Symmetry: D2
Subunit: 349 residues, 4 copies
């Protein structure tokens, strides 16, 4: 029950409004809920829809009338009109038309770019051009100048993933505009850092984000395959049966690519069904290849190549593989783990 | 400019709404601002107002009709009706009437309690009673059962500070209800941990929050005084001239009391004016003792004993001491520092 | 068996000597032993002997003819004439006569000074005078200028403990000579750092050694007592029953006082017998107060106030308390733990 | 001067011997030297000598009469007959004859094996066979079962480098004997861990030694080459001009391969002369390929393929490259750095 609804009490309460006081006893339980109950909801975006809307955006929105910001933000139906896939993350399909470019900027927000379709596009990160192609994870960590340049008559689309929504709500955003379109097969960063177990004596200082600008498909495919081959041979390797998986990491540290964002890739042998997990914080997945399904909150949704979905904080989820099922993944887990808020429930266990 | 306002474009845009797409090019700059520009605003609450409203709340709201949650949340005028002092923090004046109690609960949200007026109240934290008195900082870190019990015919008020607003927006909240009202002068925690430079062989494992349940006035006063005395003697000690200051810390680690919240105490020799600072993230201060002023965004506000104010992300601020000026402080700085978002501008420097 | 003792083989072997080759197959097992088997042996030094030899040294060795280096190194009978208590540590009884002084030097070797008998002696550490008295642990960490000055007509003796033997064998030794004999009751360091759970905003940077120059008896006694009182009350605290114990720590970090040396203090309720332990690396203990015994390798030795003993790597040991038994302790454990060589066997467990 | 040589003093001194006391004032300065002055001396071993003595050892010392321990320890002429290359390190040429094997053991001492000549030998490390070939660095970290098996009619030689001398002097040595000779091209470890910037979700826990069992030539060559190519292009990369260099690292951590031992590889463009360095602790180098020289203490020695040399603590050294000069390197630097004893002087700087 509340306090007696008296004239004295309504006066007290008129004073509260005047004085910028809100009394705890008027509040609803869910200011401190039994467990996390997100405003954001589990949602799926069909690739064939995203691709159709992106080609269309490309016709209608050329450069000089919107075309240098041609990204279609996946907006969670529960997040009140904000361009947020979850409370922490932004996820958009950038569509780069034939021969298009962008100038250099920087910002505190951390970003990656995961190539879906296309080749011959370079993103230049602090002056170092990083060739882009299908299955490549690129990084443009906080405060690194990045611009891009298409070298071809062909469109490219990629997932444009950022901690924009965390950064906006917590007030950490900074942004600056900056000052030959070279096309090396491999960036300097990779030429220094993509040799396994080796570290340059000039790179002895640890960094906060990874210095690897592209994690190329090749390597991601080979690791996932070797984990499956090791399963066939009775050797331990997969996280769970028929579930191969790698985390993309900062080689100076062995930790996450950037402070706010985790990236991973999972490959599921056909028939594999994962155990249901409740994880604190939000994750987004994208079907790289194959066919299968997700369950979220008990509800199964069938998935096709390119489809993207979000699991908010604590929503129970699992994946199931009809064919062999490749999935790119990202999450706000390094925020929850850095701050000791992370909890995990797994069904068996 | 935007794309040509054509029927085709309005169709594209009707599809976006249907499909939960929001295009980056429609967005306003301030999704990624030049620097942080908070929705929250600098604001001051006058203690004499908070005290008047608290006594009143005590008459009108007894136990069984709201009285076990008698906290008056300082609500930022810019934060749209949420009981938030800033986007990350909650700050309330809890008013405990004569002989009142509360039962044990726990929650993932981290909390402290800074005693303003009163004595003879124990908060019991995982079964360990912590006597409360004026100038004491108490902790009830995430997931620690806490309840309280007043032992006296006298009211007590304290600042009830939590990371409630961070926890709600990011979805990390959990909460549980729990299962003799002993009155020791000192808690076990303090009996183990409040011996300087000494650590118990049974407490060799590092912890995420501090195990010190009360940081008593005595010690805080003595440290601040010794720093001033050391200044008089030509020895280095103060952070800036006439500006003595301590940070409350976790002795297992030397870091912050809890993962999301920093606490500090500042004592200003009369006449001292601090250099203007822009700091990422938000802080709240409370005048423990003395008289002086704050400048925030260029605007001076005079301050009296008990007055509380908030400096959102990047608002330029300084303090000025007319008499000798004691101030309790807290902030979301460990979140910004844990995630490499922290930046600091200082005027001289 | 060896290779056939042939003229060819003796030639091979004459070549080895010539060429600075020593073949593994000629070596004895104990270049890589089943477990650690120290050259050093368990040994006890009787205080009444150390005191007698120290007074004597004081008569015969005044200043200008040896008296500024009046330390009597405990030399392990197994360590071949080196002034080593163990392979890693040096432990000596420094005897300071009436009014004597020493000038400032520094060195990479880490050092502490544990006051046994005496008062009114200051050691000055980087210009900061640290009053010395009975039961105080003082530090003079690596590379800190230290000199001392006696202020009284009375001798003082203290344990002078260093990582001299580690430093000599591994080649890390550096040494420099340096450039009013003030007598403050408390050093600056302590005035800044001996307030429990508080840290100065000017001391926000972590350090490698502790900045606390004296860990005074007072605090050590109070902690040990509170742990015993907590045992009487059914509260967890002691490491083992009737075994109270603290580790001296670096407050910036919560770790060991200095990188190579651990210090601790143990208080045993009468009747308490500890469980036998095999620990990697060496430790030295000194009976501060009480009467009791040690077992080392199965052999019991009775102990009196001041007596000192060493347990080399892996020697099984325990302590037994006839009266209430106070013991200062140091070891090379931070070297073994830093390098993952530490192992521990305990009898029950 | 000493104390007066009196009968009383000789008595005092007879008591010291009796009582296991050695007085500091009798000691020589160099118990705490101005800077490190090693017992060990700079020394070179000519490969053509090591190879000749190894073939010979192979004839004279077959299996069953010494042949399973056919390693020729490089013994520093200054270290009094111990099989030590420096006070911290052991370095030997293991010579494995046609078809020979060894059974599994383990020990706390950390070890690597750097292949010089040969192929078709597997070392099996905790049951995982690691193919060996020229230029490969293999690890067998502390406490990992390792045995080997030759698969060929051909001898192989490798550098057999351990922290044997540190382990013996400090007393940390443990050793155990253990319980199909499979020949995979690549070990499991490498199949999991040698994909750049990728980490298996089953390997999320940090380790103390690297889990990479072989750092193959291929990768080491490619990194060194790419650093030189990057120099040609005006991009920063080399540690110094014409001086390319990588450190072998633990990918879970980015730190050193094992806690006591650092490994590195340097490639010098012809004509390159390095700046003179004094580094705390000892290092050993082996000419993998090319021709050039070392200066140590001012004395130049010409070097050929395979030649090995040691620079004790603080000996000033530099390398000079007549042709293009490839050098494997190891040191006790992680011990000095872990314990804050490391110091570095460089000539320019
Ligand atoms: O990082 C950027 O360039 C960027 C900024 C805002 C939205 C999408 C993006 O790729
Ligand atoms: O920690 C609590 O008991 C608490 C919970 C919500 C609001 C204010 C509070 O002190
Ligand atoms: O630290 C010193 O002054 C010292 C040096 C050598 C021996 C004993 C000592 O106290
Ligand atoms: O690691 C070993 O097997 C070993 C042990 C002693 C000497 C040389 C060695 O390779
Ligand atoms: Fe950007
Ligand atoms: Fe609570
Ligand atoms: Fe000294
Ligand atoms: Fe071995």
């Amino acid at each position: 029950m509340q306090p007696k609804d008296t004239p004295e009490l309504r006066a007290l309460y008129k004073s509260f409004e005047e004085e910028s006081i809100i009394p705890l006893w008027t509040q609803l339980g869910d200011l401190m809920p039994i467990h996390p109950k997100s405003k954001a909801v589990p949602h799926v975006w069909k690739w064939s829809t995203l691709l159709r809307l992106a080609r269309k955006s490309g016709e209608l929105v050329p450069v000089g009338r919107g075309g240098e910001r041609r990204a279609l933000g996946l907006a969670n139906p529960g997040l009140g009109g904000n361009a947020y896939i979850s409370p922490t993350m932004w996820a958009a399909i950038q569509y780069l038309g034939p021969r298009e470019t962008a100038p250099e900027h920087r910002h505190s927000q951390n970003a990656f770019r995961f190539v879906v379709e296309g080749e011959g596009v370079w993103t230049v990160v602090n002056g170092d051009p990083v060739r882009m192609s299908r299955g490549d994870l690129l990084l443009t960590p906080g405060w690194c100048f990045h611009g891009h340049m298409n070298d071809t008559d062909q469109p490219m689309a990629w997932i444009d993933g950022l901690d924009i929504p965390f950064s906006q709500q917590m007030d950490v955003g900074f942004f600056e505009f900056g000052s030959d379109y070279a096309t090396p097969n491999f960036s300097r960063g990779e030429r220094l850092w993509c040799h396994p177990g080796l570290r340059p004596l000039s790179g002895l200082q640890n960094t906060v984000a990874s210095p690897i600008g592209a994690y190329r498909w090749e390597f991601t495919d080979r690791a996932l395959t070797e984990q499956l081959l090791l399963e066939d041979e009775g050797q331990p390797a997969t996280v769970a049966p028929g579930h191969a998986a790698i985390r993309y990491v900062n080689p100076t540290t062995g930790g996450d690519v950037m402070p706010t964002l985790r990236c991973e890739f999972h490959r599921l042998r056909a028939g594999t069904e994962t155990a249901t997990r409740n994880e604190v914080g939000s994750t987004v997945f994208q079907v790289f290849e194959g066919a299968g399904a997700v369950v979220m909150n008990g509800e199964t949704t069938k998935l096709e190549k390119g489809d993207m979905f979000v699991v908010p904080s604590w929503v129970p989820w699992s994946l199931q593989a009809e064919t062999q099922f490749d999935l790119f993944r990202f999450s706000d887990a390094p925020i929850m783990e850095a701050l000791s808020f992370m909890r995990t429930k797994i069904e068996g266990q």
